[PDB]
Amino acid sequence: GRSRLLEDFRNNRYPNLQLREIAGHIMEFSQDQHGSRFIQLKLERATPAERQLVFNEILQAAYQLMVDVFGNYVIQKFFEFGSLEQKLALAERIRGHVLSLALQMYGCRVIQKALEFIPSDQQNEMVRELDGHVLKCVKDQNGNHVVQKCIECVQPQSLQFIIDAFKGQVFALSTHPYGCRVIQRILEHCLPDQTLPILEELHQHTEQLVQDQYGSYVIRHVLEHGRPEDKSKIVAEIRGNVLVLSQHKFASNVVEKCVTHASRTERAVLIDEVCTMNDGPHSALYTMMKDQYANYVVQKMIDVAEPGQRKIVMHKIRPHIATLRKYTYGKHILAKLEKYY
RNA sequence: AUUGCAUAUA
């Protein structure tokens, strides 16, 4: 049951209702779809005084609002465009509920918004609360975004305990749908004193990751953003095994990236691989050009190839226009000869 | 993903 005021506001009997005019009914309006939207909108127009009028009523039951399907937007509003005193007050209502919040559907949205806007000191304080709950957090549909949020906003040295828990896990986590999301963030924001052990666990698993639904994602991330030496390491593993990884669903994609991102020289050595090396009757190319995955790799290959190497690959392909005609996964490889007709 | 893949609120 809602106060007669809230209802009346629902029917739209207040076209110019003001913030002041709702005093004593914040909490109620904040837990209401439209009441919530109304407050949100108003806040922006509101003076510091007006704003504080709202802050007082919500501060008292902040916890409630933070886990509320509608309330949490109101709290987030204060974390962004709000006084430093207010943010600290809210940060303070967080003390001791971080984890439960982080695993919570609306709570986690507030934690994230808080992480972005509150000072380092309250930041680190929040982070701590996750100690010994990292993995549980990482594997949480809610918790994971929070974790990703720390890694990007928080000081990397307040993060060691994270790394610490990832030891002996990197592989398990890179094959997790939420876990691989955290690994990846970590590769972008963390210190070499921390990313050294991760890239290490990863290489020692390359062959497995490259065929994992999620493992490949991590791999592609390194091929696309990592250090040249860490790329080459990956590039070393794909060599000799190009034909097989290409008809695979997930390694297919990784192979394209090795291509797309390898040194000019590596890219020559891989392109040669499918032309020189053999698969029974014809070359690997003959086999790939008609596959449902490898046909993409051929394509990518033609695109990056140096004019010099483009010719052969083409030369090698031309002799089989007869088969590719009769193959759907190869109708693009056909037209591609246009580029080279 | 277009013949081939992943990302939690009104």
UniProtKB/Swiss-Prot annotation:
Positions of the UniProt region annotated as Guanine-nucleotide binding in RNA target: 252-256
Consequence of substituting R318W: In NEDMSF; likely pathogenic; results in reduced PUM1 protein levels and decreased post-transcriptional repression of E2F3 and ATXN1
Annotated spans, Non-specific-nucleotide binding in RNA target: 144-148
Region (Uracil-nucleotide binding in RNA target): 72-76, 216-220, 295-299
Gene that encodes the chain: PUM1
Induction: Strongly down-regulated in keratinocytes upon UVB irradiation.
Disease: Spinocerebellar ataxia 47: A form of spinocerebellar ataxia, a clinically and genetically heterogeneous group of cerebellar disorders. Patients show progressive incoordination of gait and often poor coordination of hands, speech and eye movements, due to degeneration of the cerebellum with variable involvement of the brainstem and spinal cord. SCA47 is an autosomal dominant disease with a highly variable phenotype and incomplete penetrance. Clinical features include developmental disability, ataxia, and seizures.
Oligomeric form and interacting partners: Recruits the CCR4-POP2-NOT deadenylase leading to translational inhibition and mRNA degradation. In case of viral infection, interacts with DHX58. Interacts with TRIM71 (via NHL repeats) in an RNA-dependent manner.
Chain positions covered by the region annotation Adenine-nucleotide binding in RNA target: 36-40, 108-112, 180-184
Domain characteristics, as noted in the entry: The pumilio repeats mediate the association with RNA by packing together to form a right-handed superhelix that approximates a half donut. RNA-binding occurs on the concave side of the surface. PUM1 is composed of 8 pumilio repeats of 36 residues; each repeat binds a single nucleotide in its RNA target. Residues at positions 12 and 16 of the pumilio repeat bind each RNA base via hydrogen bonding or van der Waals contacts with the Watson-Crick edge, while the amino acid at position 13 makes a stacking interaction.
Extent of the Pumilio repeats: 21-56, 57-92, 93-128, 129-164, 165-200, 201-236, 237-272, 276-315
Protein's name according to its UniProt entry: Pumilio homolog 1
Domain spans labelled PUM-HD: 1-341
Function: Sequence-specific RNA-binding protein that acts as a post-transcriptional repressor by binding the 3'-UTR of mRNA targets. Binds to an RNA consensus sequence, the Pumilio Response Element (PRE), 5'-UGUANAUA-3', that is related to the Nanos Response Element (NRE). Mediates post-transcriptional repression of transcripts via different mechanisms: acts via direct recruitment of the CCR4-POP2-NOT deadenylase leading to translational inhibition and mRNA degradation. Also mediates deadenylation-independent repression by promoting accessibility of miRNAs.
Localization per Swiss-Prot or TrEMBL: Cytoplasm; Cytoplasm, P-body; Cytoplasmic granule
Parent-protein start and end of this portion: 828 to 1168 of 1186
Reported tissue expression: Expressed in brain, heart, kidney, muscle, intestine and stomach. Not expressed in cerebellum, corpus callosum, caudate nucleus, hippocampus, medulla oblongata and putamen. Expressed in all fetal tissues tested.
Domain of life: Eukaryota
Annotated consequence of substituting C180N: Specifically binds uracil-nucleotide in RNA target
